[PDB]
Design a protein around this motif. Sequence first.
Motif, mmCIF file in Angstrom:
data_model
loop_
_atom_site.group_PDB
_atom_site.id
_atom_site.type_symbol
_atom_site.label_atom_id
_atom_site.label_comp_id
_atom_site.label_asym_id
_atom_site.label_seq_id
_atom_site.Cartn_x
_atom_site.Cartn_y
_atom_site.Cartn_z
ATOM 1 N N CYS A 47 5.966 21.306 -0.623
ATOM 2 C CA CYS A 47 4.565 21.666 -0.755
ATOM 3 C C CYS A 47 4.404 23.155 -0.448
ATOM 4 N N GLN A 49 3.108 26.812 0.771
ATOM 5 C CA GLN A 49 2.301 27.186 1.912
ATOM 6 C C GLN A 49 0.916 27.539 1.402
ATOM 7 N N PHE A 50 -0.082 27.214 2.206
ATOM 8 C CA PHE A 50 -1.456 27.477 1.837
ATOM 9 C C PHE A 50 -1.754 28.953 2.001
ATOM 10 N N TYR A 54 -6.663 30.315 -1.784
ATOM 11 C CA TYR A 54 -6.631 29.006 -2.419
ATOM 12 C C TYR A 54 -7.949 28.298 -2.160
ATOM 13 N N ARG A 55 -8.644 27.925 -3.230
ATOM 14 C CA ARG A 55 -9.801 27.069 -3.039
ATOM 15 C C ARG A 55 -9.353 25.706 -2.548
ATOM 16 N N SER A 56 -8.247 25.206 -3.097
ATOM 17 C CA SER A 56 -7.725 23.914 -2.700
ATOM 18 C C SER A 56 -6.267 23.806 -3.116
ATOM 19 N N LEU A 57 -5.535 23.011 -2.355
ATOM 20 C CA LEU A 57 -4.153 22.719 -2.691
ATOM 21 C C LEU A 57 -3.906 21.268 -2.326
ATOM 22 N N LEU A 58 -3.497 20.476 -3.309
ATOM 23 C CA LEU A 58 -3.158 19.078 -3.111
ATOM 24 C C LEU A 58 -1.676 18.912 -3.391
ATOM 25 N N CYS A 59 -0.970 18.285 -2.459
ATOM 26 C CA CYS A 59 0.413 17.889 -2.661
ATOM 27 C C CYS A 59 0.478 16.380 -2.519
ATOM 28 N N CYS A 60 1.208 15.711 -3.406
ATOM 29 C CA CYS A 60 1.206 14.256 -3.311
ATOM 30 C C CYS A 60 2.492 13.711 -3.907
ATOM 31 N N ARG B 55 1.805 10.516 1.719
ATOM 32 C CA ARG B 55 1.452 10.253 0.335
ATOM 33 C C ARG B 55 0.675 11.414 -0.261
ATOM 34 N N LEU B 57 -1.441 15.423 0.908
ATOM 35 C CA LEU B 57 -1.979 16.409 1.826
ATOM 36 C C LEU B 57 -2.891 17.294 0.999
ATOM 37 N N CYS B 59 -5.572 20.572 1.370
ATOM 38 C CA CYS B 59 -6.219 21.615 2.142
ATOM 39 C C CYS B 59 -7.196 22.335 1.233
#
Lengths: 67, 67
Positions: A47, A49-50, A54-60, B55, B57, B59
Amino acid sequence: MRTCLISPSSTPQTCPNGQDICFLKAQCDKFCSIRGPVIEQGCVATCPQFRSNYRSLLCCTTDNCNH
Amino acid sequence: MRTCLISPSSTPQTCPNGQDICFLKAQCDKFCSIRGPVIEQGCVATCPQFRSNYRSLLCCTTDNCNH
Protein backbone atom coordinates in the motif's frame (compact mmCIF):
# COMPACT_ATOMS: atom_id res chain seq x y z
CA MET A 1 -3.62 -14.03 -8.18
CA ARG A 2 -5.09 -10.63 -7.74
CA THR A 3 -7.28 -8.80 -10.23
CA CYS A 4 -7.94 -5.08 -9.74
CA LEU A 5 -9.76 -2.27 -11.50
CA ILE A 6 -7.34 -0.27 -13.66
CA SER A 7 -7.40 3.36 -14.74
CA PRO A 8 -8.81 4.99 -16.81
CA SER A 9 -11.68 2.60 -17.68
CA SER A 10 -12.15 0.95 -14.24
CA THR A 11 -11.92 -2.42 -16.07
CA PRO A 12 -10.79 -5.53 -14.16
CA GLN A 13 -7.27 -6.66 -15.05
CA THR A 14 -4.89 -9.30 -13.69
CA CYS A 15 -2.09 -7.96 -11.44
CA PRO A 16 1.61 -8.38 -12.21
CA ASN A 17 3.59 -10.88 -10.14
CA GLY A 18 4.26 -9.79 -6.58
CA GLN A 19 1.45 -7.21 -6.45
CA ASP A 20 -1.50 -8.52 -4.42
CA ILE A 21 -3.05 -5.23 -3.27
CA CYS A 22 -5.58 -3.19 -5.24
CA PHE A 23 -5.61 0.57 -4.80
CA LEU A 24 -7.78 3.59 -5.60
CA LYS A 25 -6.03 6.95 -5.29
CA ALA A 26 -7.47 10.46 -5.66
CA GLN A 27 -4.67 13.04 -5.73
CA CYS A 28 -4.63 16.81 -6.22
CA ASP A 29 -1.78 18.25 -8.29
CA LYS A 30 -1.20 21.91 -9.15
CA PHE A 31 -4.36 21.69 -11.32
CA CYS A 32 -6.88 20.57 -8.72
CA SER A 33 -8.53 24.01 -8.80
CA ILE A 34 -9.15 23.61 -12.55
CA ARG A 35 -10.27 19.98 -12.84
CA GLY A 36 -10.21 18.31 -9.41
CA PRO A 37 -8.19 15.25 -8.43
CA VAL A 38 -6.83 12.66 -10.84
CA ILE A 39 -8.16 9.17 -10.08
CA GLU A 40 -5.69 6.29 -10.32
CA GLN A 41 -6.59 2.60 -9.92
CA GLY A 42 -4.20 -0.31 -10.08
CA CYS A 43 -2.23 -3.10 -8.46
CA VAL A 44 0.62 -2.67 -5.97
CA ALA A 45 2.96 -4.83 -3.92
CA THR A 46 2.62 -2.58 -0.86
CA CYS A 47 0.00 0.00 0.00
CA PRO A 48 1.56 3.36 -0.98
CA GLN A 49 2.45 5.81 1.72
CA PHE A 50 -0.17 8.49 2.14
CA ARG A 51 0.77 11.91 0.82
CA SER A 52 -0.46 15.32 1.92
CA ASN A 53 -1.98 15.93 -1.53
CA TYR A 54 -4.11 12.76 -1.54
CA ARG A 55 -7.82 13.35 -1.26
CA SER A 56 -8.17 9.64 -0.56
CA LEU A 57 -6.27 6.39 -0.82
CA LEU A 58 -7.92 2.98 -0.59
CA CYS A 59 -5.91 -0.23 -0.42
CA CYS A 60 -7.76 -3.52 -0.38
CA THR A 61 -7.21 -7.26 -0.78
CA THR A 62 -10.35 -8.56 -2.49
CA ASP A 63 -10.52 -8.90 -6.28
CA ASN A 64 -11.71 -5.71 -8.03
CA CYS A 65 -12.30 -4.06 -4.63
CA ASN A 66 -10.75 -0.71 -5.65
CA HIS A 67 -13.81 1.27 -6.74
CA MET B 1 -10.69 21.60 11.25
CA ARG B 2 -11.46 17.95 10.49
CA THR B 3 -14.39 15.74 11.46
CA CYS B 4 -14.19 11.98 11.04
CA LEU B 5 -16.49 9.06 11.70
CA ILE B 6 -15.69 7.01 14.79
CA SER B 7 -16.51 3.31 15.09
CA PRO B 8 -18.79 1.48 16.01
CA SER B 9 -21.63 4.02 15.75
CA SER B 10 -20.50 6.00 12.66
CA THR B 11 -20.42 9.04 14.88
CA PRO B 12 -18.84 12.22 13.50
CA GLN B 13 -16.20 13.52 15.88
CA THR B 14 -14.12 16.68 15.83
CA CYS B 15 -10.51 15.64 15.37
CA PRO B 16 -7.98 16.96 17.88
CA ASN B 17 -5.36 19.44 16.75
CA GLY B 18 -2.72 17.64 14.66
CA GLN B 19 -5.07 14.98 13.22
CA ASP B 20 -6.34 15.89 9.75
CA ILE B 21 -6.80 12.39 8.24
CA CYS B 22 -9.84 10.13 8.58
CA PHE B 23 -9.21 6.41 8.35
CA LEU B 24 -11.17 3.21 8.04
CA LYS B 25 -9.45 -0.14 8.64
CA ALA B 26 -11.22 -3.40 7.93
CA GLN B 27 -9.22 -6.08 9.75
CA CYS B 28 -9.98 -9.80 9.90
CA ASP B 29 -9.93 -12.10 12.87
CA LYS B 30 -8.74 -15.69 12.35
CA PHE B 31 -12.21 -16.74 11.14
CA CYS B 32 -13.64 -13.80 9.19
CA SER B 33 -16.15 -15.22 6.71
CA ILE B 34 -19.36 -15.21 8.78
CA ARG B 35 -19.35 -11.74 10.35
CA GLY B 36 -16.71 -10.08 8.14
CA PRO B 37 -13.85 -7.81 9.16
CA VAL B 38 -13.82 -5.63 12.23
CA ILE B 39 -14.27 -2.04 11.07
CA GLU B 40 -12.29 0.62 12.95
CA GLN B 41 -12.78 4.31 12.11
CA GLY B 42 -11.21 7.46 13.49
CA CYS B 43 -9.02 10.54 13.26
CA VAL B 44 -5.27 10.19 12.83
CA ALA B 45 -2.22 12.33 12.12
CA THR B 46 -0.62 9.88 9.67
CA CYS B 47 -2.26 7.12 7.66
CA PRO B 48 -1.71 3.72 9.38
CA GLN B 49 0.46 0.99 7.92
CA PHE B 50 -1.20 -1.84 5.97
CA ARG B 51 -1.14 -5.19 7.80
CA SER B 52 -1.35 -8.83 6.70
CA ASN B 53 -4.90 -9.24 8.08
CA TYR B 54 -6.38 -6.08 6.50
CA ARG B 55 -9.16 -6.45 3.96
CA SER B 56 -9.01 -2.71 3.38
CA LEU B 57 -7.47 0.53 4.58
CA LEU B 58 -8.89 3.90 3.57
CA CYS B 59 -7.27 7.25 4.39
CA CYS B 60 -8.94 10.46 3.30
CA THR B 61 -8.99 14.17 4.01
CA THR B 62 -12.60 15.28 3.61
CA ASP B 63 -14.98 15.45 6.58
CA ASN B 64 -16.63 12.11 7.47
CA CYS B 65 -15.06 10.48 4.38
CA ASN B 66 -14.00 7.33 6.26
CA HIS B 67 -16.89 5.00 5.47
